[PDB]
Design a protein around this nucleic acid. Structure first.
Ligand SMILES: [Mg+2]
Ligand SMILES: [Zn+2]
Lengths: 1320, 653
DNA sequence: GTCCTATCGATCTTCGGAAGAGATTCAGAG
DNA sequence: CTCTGAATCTCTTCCCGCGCGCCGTAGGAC
């Protein structure tokens, strides 16, 4: 057994029992391997930019009769890396270069070119790149593309009751949904006439398509219907009985011959009669003329002699018609079999709607129904009809759509073309008619086998296609008209349409979300959201219980708990922990192979429609350490049904008890106990915790923290193994070991940590070291904590000591009462960093300046600016302080002032300048910083190679060919001028001194390039001269009104900040830190929070025994004994750990991190039994009831009965109150109508909205209302007369008439509608 | 308007008029230059099709756009509907002198107060503050007083605490379904930043305290203060508008405390002695000499208001408990002690409070309600009424009840395994076997909770009502009655599929114990349905209330008595057998339509237009009356309104 | 690079809203 | 031959507050 060097510092005591056979996949492979799938070229041309190019090129005009064609593409390295790009505020992007070859043919000749011109990689655009954290950077702002989930291409059959006609019956419908191009709907009319339409246009008679494919009705009838024949021999019109065509229906008429009668008139027909029908060989039989007089004919019948019609396919027969046509010599008359149950006549019925004659008349009807007002025309019509279904420019089932289609038509194969074909539509019709004949089933729409995930590497491939589609339309014309003589490919194309397409996508699409960089969980659970909304999806306002609800295939694929309750429940889901995207995009999830009777430890991923074909055991099911099930019969799910089945009947097993959830819920301990309301609100509140100041560890967790904090990319992780060379909380630098070094390198990995910086939500993000100088580290160890982490565990909140009890009502209803001790400790203080910016311009009156020489202001304000016109770093500032002394010509003091209300310390400034514009000493101050920071880190390589190279001189001197009359005092390349002879050592000296010079020249260009990065200005917007951004850090504390939450979806405002003496304290005199209310636990059934408290209490107790054993100077062998006795506690828990191997050093180093509570894991559905919590509390010296008697610090009286006390984990949420408290006396008003502005970002007035006005009207209160909506609001006179009457204290109003109502009058009178006020 | 740098905001109409005027410039040209019919029919079409845009863009074949297919908002799009003047700016509009904050509970408030932050009061009341600094002559005028407020000088608070000293401020949450959703309170100043609201009133707002923001408005004029104090002040609104039922209905912790205070425990310290009054009952409690729920006898006095309305005071021994003696001290002097002499719970105390309003009236009732609140909080504190997992009680018969029912389900299965029962019958009987198990588990668990308390009566054990923590909360009506405790420790029971059809194998577990993965996953088909319903419903409910006020708003009570003799007839609603509502629900407080006779003949009982107030409806309940004819607003023959008598009792008064 | 003039007058606006009601379109017949 | 039934089309409605976040005419000709 082994633990990595960052595990072996706080080995979380694990209570899990099921052995985790599959370790959690890298939590963002959803995203990264999607974008990698876009960006890689791939000669198997599907997927990626290359697939899109090969979707358009080769490209040509017929009249140009020449082409240009895509050869290959290259993607250059990005002009600025992520860190610098996120400073400079551009987007992190890469230049796209494409080998286009233009080919010039000739007339008359064979096509052999007159010339062709490979343009040496024409520039095509700048595609953004994904950062390894899975995020794009789009205008310095960091953005995330959520995966979409939408209806896969294919064919889908559907039906409903009551939603249509409601006379008990149901109507059936088929759709073909291509990936790109037109939708085709087939549907029956109630009277089972069949109809078709494109793109939800008008309804058409369905055979109009078969007509359009030029089947005659005779052929259609041979495609759809079974034949029944009459042979006019042995007697007039004998009949071809196929026996099985009579079963269950009544023999209402005479059928007999030759010996035993099968079934006489009026009786059902059955098997024994059919067998007698077979044994008599009923190949022809006598039937009454009423039977033939029922028929509809199959085939066309002219009279050959007159040459003229008597009957036609699907025309209906009668005795006299039969007589004349058989009399005309047509001795075989042929018709259809149409039993109403099994063979309904729907296509013949459709031929009774049909207005068409034949192909052309249908194409006429198509073109007139689709493009009303354009002329139909034989040469023109096909340029509609073919581009509906048969042409690549406008119809495309991708490979997934073809697969799904073929699977539903039960085809043998799935390598198929993306267009339809005649037989491809006909098969849909046949399958739809089988459904109406009752012999088939409709698909469940909302099934994760019918909806597939699209992620970034596919949405961007489509938007890039829209680009190439608009270049198609330009380049075809330019090629067709062009001379082909001077044009080269970089004339043929230009980037602007591609760049528009892809930049608008990544910038502004409904799915290019601005990342919730709130804390490391919220980064991740956002990068793996599954969204039903957006382009090609549904809409949040326009769906109902059919899709919001969970479905049985969600299990293991989508988390049922973690969805953002509100107007879009379940239109957003979170992709479950273990789930994965299949090749095609369907969600698939891993299961264990059950081989005969033993659970084999191999995992097969199952998609949602493989799963229904097996029976799959629930993850809890026990096994015998050989791996046979222990239970003789076991719970499994099967076909959405679940029940018990035999041992060795079951065929797959779940991989882990965590498989059903997302990371967002998988982090709740004891989730096994909570109402799924309160699980949901928990798993939504964890992603809102703001990173507190001094974050640590949850004492009770699930062991998922060790993964969320690492995979979220925000802790800095050791890229290669080695030893820590230096640390200073800004840099960490690692001497990588030679077993993982690359041979020419210096061999030294710096990590410049990010310090105090705004998150996208204004919380700070300073990384801090966890290493010590000279400490060893191994690849993948956490070197530095992120925000909200410590030692690499996720740590959103603080393990506050809580007791559950009423307290004089301060924790009524939900509220949290808090002791002053928590605020004094800086437990929940949090740092909020704002960014304020002053732009400056080349305006129409002339160019602005930044200066201290501001007009109309004296040193009373300017004392905080430097001499340049920017605030000093470390200035502490408040409302109205001038941060940046901008001024405008013709001079106007327009300068950046700190907005009202806010306050903070100015932690940093940045300065950006156009080209050809002068700097200033705060630009030179920033240059001095950044230059020096680049140069230092470069020197720490050049120094290391210089030292190595002079050793490489010294050693091969000192070992042999010594010249050491004096040695180390000398400049170690002046060592060359010593008198060594022209034996090889002097030539080694000369060569290695040339290697030393070239080592200098190497950095002599590397530092020049770096300084050239810093020396330059930046790509400002048009009009601006320069911009400066100034950052205010605020250390906000905690106060009444702030919100805190547990993990269990318990939440409250904190209501009072009680002084320590008022907190309850125990029989040992320690006060409780928080007092939660009890009644929320039964009333909202989230009792898992109690077991977290008790297990938390035990967690404190073990640290309590350890801390005592470190204050007392216990020897390690006794201390190790107690720690070991803690890890081995409980049943056959999964984990094993041997402090015997920890070398004493690391036992003390471990104890020094347990000494405030042993951290515990309670994996989600696999937790501690109660009997193991008691066992831990007994190992501490604690009361196993979990409860303690408490006393009230207001009197020292005892409380009656003990109360729960223990260490809950509590999160401060980002809804803290000073960010919401607001009030307005008077200020701005809007221009169009004079009502007040609305906001906090503007000094706004609260909306006395519509419902409040009914509320006043429902008291008698008329004067209040009159005021509220005029004098206080709108009447431009009355409010200034009111204000003066109030300062005069007159308490009287003059109410007038609101100017917004006069706006209405003019806006009506701006129609030709004379509205007017009237007098009497 | 210009925006960020030298760019005009795309100001839609000016793009529409621009279309028109361009087209008109061309059409004047091509008319005067005398173009042929086909050309002028072109421009004339394009002009008509442009003025079409300017009036009501998008009633055309397609709305015209100037961006990524954003339709430009035309005039008629400015008038109508949810973003247009009538709803957006006329009917309700933003207002000055307002602010908002997170509310938080303030237990010490008297019912009429709320605390609001000094920062807000100072930024809200500014006009009134200047109206004192000039009146002190301490500031020269606005120009100085503005600065003197900005500097936040030491005087200003003593001025503020004179400005505000009794100026009602209006607090309302949003949405605000009903009149009780805006109320006025006298403010009291606070150091923090939250609005301290009164505990009992949070229920009216449906203000939970979990971070639920609330807006405040100052009324400016004298008339707005007189309306606020007379009508909207919380003391004037103890009743619902909708039904004769209090809205001050006690907060869960208050009723928990009063339940705990008034129980009897058959063994206690100081049990069985005899006392001369509540005051020495309290000395006995507070010194720790008697336990609060100990049995005792006390001398009591109580008061009754006679047939005239004047007090008769009476005195007796009473047999009771220490805590019922202490609680009697809070009741105003006119109620009978028989209302307190019982272990109180949420229904029992609501009627307590209601009877106070019945007998004394409003002004004592609001103070009595305040005292109840303070009392309940204080004894609920001493009670230490915690919750703890050792207090979840599982009846061990549960194990047998499953192990029995499982085989009987398998009997239904074995018949099915022999074809001996139909595919419908197998299912619809199995789910009834699970129901028969579930009722038994629930019944055994409620018996076990009551069973957990038994104690020595100085010799031999005897049982009493269980002090088990979760059972106090159910049996008091604080929170979480039968349907919750059943799930916490009984069984979770049957669950339903998405299409409502029932699961063949229930959740026989409960949240004290673990759900396995499947039981949990099926559990979410419940809860996610219930959340989808909430988020989906909250639209249609609002569109319903809109349609209603916007049809009802034309009515006002406008005559005293329209003079009808017509009306409609009220009976208990008798259906499905028994009566689902009695007559005293329907008829109370309407006026009689016609003379109401004695059951029988010729004896009249109520004159023909008398309000049937409570003493009349109790009288009808003394009689064998079944049907009563009353006036109803549908029959009131007032034109353009309703007469008062036809409407009858005002429920809030 | 700036200023002025115009929109697919050589396509393709999205299927995944329901409803609920009206205006407007057609049966079986006196 | 069109008169009362019914049939397909479009129009209109869809909680209240609130807080962030960003993003914001183009193309051609002189
Ligand atoms: Mg709330
Ligand atoms: Zn009336």
């Amino acid at each position: 057994m082994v633990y990595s060097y960052t595990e072996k510092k706080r080995i979380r005591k694990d209570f899990g029992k099921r052995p985790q056979v599959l370790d959690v996949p890298y939590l963002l492979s959803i995203q990264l391997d999607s974008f990698q799938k876009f960006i890689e070229q791939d000669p198997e041309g599907q997927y990626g930019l290359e697939a899109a190019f090969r979707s358009v090129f080769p490209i040509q005009s017929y009249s140009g009769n020449s082409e240009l064609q895509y050869v290959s593409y290259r993607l250059g390295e990005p002009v600025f890396d992520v860190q610098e790009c996120q400073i400079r505020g551009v987007t992190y992007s890469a230049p796209l270069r494409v080998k286009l070859r233009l080919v010039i043919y000739e007339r008359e000749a064979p096509e052999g070119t007159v010339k062709d011109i490979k343009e040496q990689e024409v520039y095509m655009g700048e595609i953004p790149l994904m950062t390894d954290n899975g995020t794009f950077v789009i205008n310095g702002t960091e953005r995330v593309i959520v995966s979409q989930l939408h209806r896969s291409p294919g064919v889908f059959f559907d039906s409903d009751k009551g939603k249509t006609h409601s006379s008990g019956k149901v109507l059936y419908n088929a759709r073909i949904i291509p990936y790109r191009g037109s939708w085709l709907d087939f549907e029956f009319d109630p009277k089972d006439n069949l109809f078709v339409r494109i793109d939800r246009r008008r309804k058409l008679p369905a055979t109009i398509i078969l007509r359009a494919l030029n089947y005659t009705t005779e052929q259609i009838l041979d495609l759809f219907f079974e034949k029944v024949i009459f042979e006019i021999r042995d007697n007039k019109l004998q009949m071809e009985l196929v026996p099985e065509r009579l079963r269950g229906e009544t023999a209402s008429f005479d059928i007999e011959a030759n010996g035993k009668v099968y079934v006489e008139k009026g009786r059902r027909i059955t098997a024994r009669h059919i067998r007698q029908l077979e044994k008599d060989d009923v190949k022809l039989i006598e039937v009454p003329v009423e039977y033939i007089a029922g028929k509809v004919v199959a085939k066309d019948y002219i009279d050959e002699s007159t040459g003229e019609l008597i009957c036609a396919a699907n025309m209906e027969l009668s005795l006299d018609l039969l007589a004349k046509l058989s009399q005309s010599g047509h001795k075989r008359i042929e018709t259809l079999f149409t039993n109403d149950l099994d063979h309904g006549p729907y296509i013949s019925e459709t031929l009774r709607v049909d207005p068409t004659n034949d192909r052309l008349s249908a194409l006429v009807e198509i073109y007139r129904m689709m493009r009303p007002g354009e002329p139909p025309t034989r040469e023109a019509a096909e340029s509609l009809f073919e581009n509906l279904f048969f042409s690549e420019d406008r119809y495309d089932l991708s490979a997934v759509g073809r697969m799904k289609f073929n699977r539903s038509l039960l085809r043998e194969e799935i390598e198929g073309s993306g267009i339809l074909s005649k037989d491809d539509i006909i098969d849909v019709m046949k399958k739809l008619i089988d459904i109406r004949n009752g012999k088939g089933e409709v698909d469940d729409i909302d099934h994760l086998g019918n909806r597939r995930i699209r992620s970034v590497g596919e949405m961007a491939e489509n938007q890039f296609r829209v680009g190439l589609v608009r270049v198609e339309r330009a380049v075809k014309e330019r090629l067709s008209l062009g001379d082909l003589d001077t044009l080269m490919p970089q004339d043929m194309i230009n980037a602007k349409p591609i760049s528009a397409a892809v930049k608008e996508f990544f910038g502004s699409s409904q799915l290019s979300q601005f990342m919730d960089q709130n804390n490391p969980l919220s980064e991740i659970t956002h990068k793996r959201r599954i969204s039903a909304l957006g382009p090609g999806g549904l809409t949040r306002e326009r769906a109902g219980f059919e899709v919001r609800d969970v479905h049985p295939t969600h299990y293991g694929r989508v988390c049922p708990i973690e969805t953002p309750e509100g107007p879009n429940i379940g239109l957003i889901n979170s992709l479950s922990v273990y789930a994965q995207t299949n090749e095609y995009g369907f969600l698939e999830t891993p299961y264990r192979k059950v081989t005969d009777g033993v659970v084999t430890d191999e995992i097969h991923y199952l998609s949602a429609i493989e799963e229904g074909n097996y029976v799959i055991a629930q993850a809890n099911s026990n096994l015998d350490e050989e791996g046979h099930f222990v239970e003789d019969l076991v719970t499994c799910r099967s076909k959405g049904e679940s029940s018990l089945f035999s041992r060795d009947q079951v065929d797959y097993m779940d991989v882990s008890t965590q498989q059903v959830v997302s990371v967002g819920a998988s982090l709740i301990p004891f989730l096994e106990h909570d109402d799924a309301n309160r699980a949901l609100m928990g798993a939504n509140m964890q992603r809102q915790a703001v990173p507190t100041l001094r974050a640590d560890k949850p004492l009770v967790g699930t062991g998922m923290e060790r993964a969320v904090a690492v995979d979220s990319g925000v802790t800095a992780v050791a890229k290669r193994g080695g030893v820590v060379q230096y640390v200073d909380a800004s840099r960490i630098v690692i001497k990588v070991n030679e077993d993982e070094m690359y041979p020419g390198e210096a061999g030294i990995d710096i990590y410049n940590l990010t310090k105090y910086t705004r998150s996208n939500q204004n919380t700070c993000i300073n990384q801090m070291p966890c290493v010590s100088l000279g400490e060893p580290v191994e690849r993948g160890d956490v070197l530095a904590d992120g925000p909200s982490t410590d030692l690499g565990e996720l740590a959103l909140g603080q393990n506050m000591r809580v007791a559950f009890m009423p307290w004089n009502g301060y924790n009524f209803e939900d509220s949290i009462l808090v002791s002053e001790r928590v605020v004094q400790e800086d437990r929940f203080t949090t740092i909020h960093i704002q960014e304020l910016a002053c732009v400056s311009r080349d305006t129409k009156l002339g160019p602005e300046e930044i200066t201290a020489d501001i007009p109309n202001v004296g040193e009373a304000a300017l004392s905080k600016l430097d001499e340049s016109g920017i605030v000093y770093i470390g200035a502490e500032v408040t409302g109205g302080d001038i941060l940046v002394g901008k001024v405008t010509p013709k001079v106007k003091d327009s300068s950046l002032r700190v907005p009202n209300g806010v306050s903070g310390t100015v932690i940093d400034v940045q300065v950006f300048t156009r080209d050809g514009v002068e700097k200033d000493k705060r630009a030179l101050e920033i240059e001095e910083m950044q230059l020096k920071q680049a140069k230092k880190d470069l020197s720490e390589e050049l120094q290391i190679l210089e030292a190595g190279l002079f050793s490489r001189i010294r050693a091969v001197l000192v070992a042999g060919g010594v010249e050491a009359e004096k040695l180390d005092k000398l400049p170690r390349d002046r060592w060359l001028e010593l008198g060594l002879t022209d034996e090889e050592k002097q030539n080694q000296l000369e060569q290695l001194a040339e290697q030393y010079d070239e080592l200098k020249h190497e950095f002599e260009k590397k530092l020049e390039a770096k300084r050239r990065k810093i020396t330059q200005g930046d790509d400002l917007a048009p009009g601006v001269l320069k911009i400066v951004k100034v950052y205010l850090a605020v250390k906000r504390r905690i106060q009444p009104g702030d919100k805190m939450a547990g993990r269990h979806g318990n939440k409250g405002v904190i209501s009072k900040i009680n002084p320590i003496e008022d907190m309850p304290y125990d029989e040992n005199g320690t006060p409780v830190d928080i007092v939660l209310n009890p009644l929320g636990v039964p009333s909202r059934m989230n009792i898992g929070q109690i077991l977290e408290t008790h297990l938390g209490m035990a967690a404190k107790g073990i640290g309590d025994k350890i801390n005592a054993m470190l204050k007392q100077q216990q020897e390690v062998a006794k201390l190790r004994e107690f720690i070991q006795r803690a890890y081995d506690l409980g049943a056959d828990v999964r984990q094993k750990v041997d402090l015997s191997t920890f070398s004493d050093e690391e036992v003390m180093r471990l104890a020094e991190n347990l000494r405030k509570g042993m951290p515990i894991a309670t994996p989600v559905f696999d937790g501690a039994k109660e009997a193991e919590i008691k066992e831990l509390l007994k190992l501490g010296d604690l009361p196993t009831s979990g409860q303690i008697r408490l006393y009230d610090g207001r009197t020292g009286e005892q409380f009656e009965r003990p109360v729960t006390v223990g260490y809950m984990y509590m999160l401060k949420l980002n809804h803290l109150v000073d960010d919401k408290m607001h009030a307005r006396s008077t200020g701005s008003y809007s221009l169009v109508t004079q009502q007040p502005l609305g906001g906090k970002a503007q000094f706004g007035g609260q909306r006395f909205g519509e419902m409040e006005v009914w509320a006043l009207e429902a008291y008698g209160a008329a004067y209040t209302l009159q005021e509220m909506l005029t004098v206080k609001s709108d009447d431009v006179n009355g409010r200034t007369k009111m204000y003066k009457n109030i300062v005069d204290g007159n308490h009287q109003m003059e109410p007038g008439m609101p100017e917004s109502f006069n706006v209405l009058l003019k806006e009506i009178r701006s129609l030709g509608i004379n509205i007017e006020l009237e007098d009497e | 308007v210009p925006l960020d740098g030298g760019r005009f905001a795309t100001s839609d109409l000016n793009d529409l008029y621009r279309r028109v005027i361009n087209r008109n410039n061309r059409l004047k040209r091509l008319l005067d230059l005398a173009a042929p019919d086909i050309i002028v029919r072109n421009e004339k079409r394009m002009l008509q099709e442009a003025v079409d845009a300017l009036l009501d863009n998008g009633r055309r074949g397609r709305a015209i756009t100037g961006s990524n297919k954003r339709p430009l908002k035309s005039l008629a799009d400015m008038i109508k509907g949810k973003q247009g003047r009538f709803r957006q700016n006329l009917l309700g509009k933003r207002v000055d002198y307002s602010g908002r904050s997170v509310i938080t509970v303030g237990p010490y408030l008297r019912l009429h107060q709320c605390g609001l932050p000094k920062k807000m009061a100072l930024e809200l009341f500014k006009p009134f503050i200047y109206g004192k600094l000039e009146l002190r002559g301490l500031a020269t005028t606005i120009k100085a007083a503005k600065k003197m407020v900005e500097r936040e000088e030491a005087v200003v608070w003593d001025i503020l605490d004179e400005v505000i000293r009794e100026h009602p401020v209006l607090l309302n949450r949003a949405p605000t379904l009903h009149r009780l959703g805006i109320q006025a309170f006298e403010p009291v100043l606070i150091e923090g930043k939250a609005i301290q609201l009164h505990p009992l009133v949070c229920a009216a707002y449906n203000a939970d305290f979990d971070g639920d923001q609330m807006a405040v408005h100052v009324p400016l004029t004298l008339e707005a203060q007189l309306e606020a104090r007379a009508l909207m002040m919380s003391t004037n609104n103890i009743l619902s508008p909708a039904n004769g039922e209090p809205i001050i209905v006690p907060s869960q912790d208050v009723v928990l405390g009063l339940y705990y205070m008034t129980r009897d425990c058959v063994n206690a310290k100081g049990e069985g002695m005899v006392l001369t009054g509540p005051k020495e009952a309290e000395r006995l409690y507070r010194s720790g000499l008697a336990s609060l729920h100990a049995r005792v006898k006390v001398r009591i006095t109580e008061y009754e208001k006679d047939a005239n309305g004047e007090l008769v005071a009476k005195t007796s021994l009473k047999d009771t408990t220490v805590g019922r003696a202490i609680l009697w001290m809070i009741v105003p002097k006119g109620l009978p002690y028989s209302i307190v002499n019982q272990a109180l719970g949420k229904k029992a105390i609501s009627k307590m409070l209601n009877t106070c309003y019945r007998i004394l009236g409003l002004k004592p009732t609001v103070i009595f309600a305040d005292q109840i609140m303070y009392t309940g909080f204080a004894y609920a504190a001493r009670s230490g009424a915690s919750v703890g997992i050792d207090d979840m009680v599982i009846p061990e018969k549960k194990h047998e009840i499953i192990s029995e029912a499982e085989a009987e389900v398998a009997e239904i299965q074995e018949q099915f395994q022999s074809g001996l029962v139909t595919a419908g019958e197998r299912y619809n009987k199995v789910i009834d076997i699970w129901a028969a198990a579930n009722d038994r588990v629930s019944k055994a668990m409620m018996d076990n909770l009551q069973t957990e308390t038994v104690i020595n009566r100085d010799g031999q054990e005897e049982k009493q009502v269980s002090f088990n923590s979760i059972y106090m909360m159910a049996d008091s009506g604080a929170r979480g009655s039968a349907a919750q405790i059943r799930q916490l420790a009984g069984m979770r029971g049957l669950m339903a599929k998405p299409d409502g059809s029932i699961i063949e194998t229930p959740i026989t577990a409960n949240f004290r114990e673990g759900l396995n993965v499947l039981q949990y996953f099926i559990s979410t088909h419940g809860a996610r349905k219930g959340l989808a319903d909430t988020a989906l419903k909250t639209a249609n409910s609002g569109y319903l209330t809109r349609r209603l006020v916007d049809v009802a708003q034309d009515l006002v009570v406008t005559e005293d008595d329209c003079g009808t003799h017509e009306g409609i007839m009220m009976t208990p609603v008798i259906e499905g057998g028994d009566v689902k509502e009695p007559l005293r629900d329907r008829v109370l407080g309407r006026v009689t339509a016609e003379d109401v006779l004695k059951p029988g003949t010729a004896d009249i009982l109520v004159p023909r237009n008398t309000l049937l107030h409570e003493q009349w409806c109790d009288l009808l309940e003394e009689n064998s009356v079944d049907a009563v004819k009353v006036r109803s607003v549908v029959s009131c023959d007032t034109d353009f309104g309703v007469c008062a008598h036809c409407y009858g009792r005002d429920l809030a008064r």
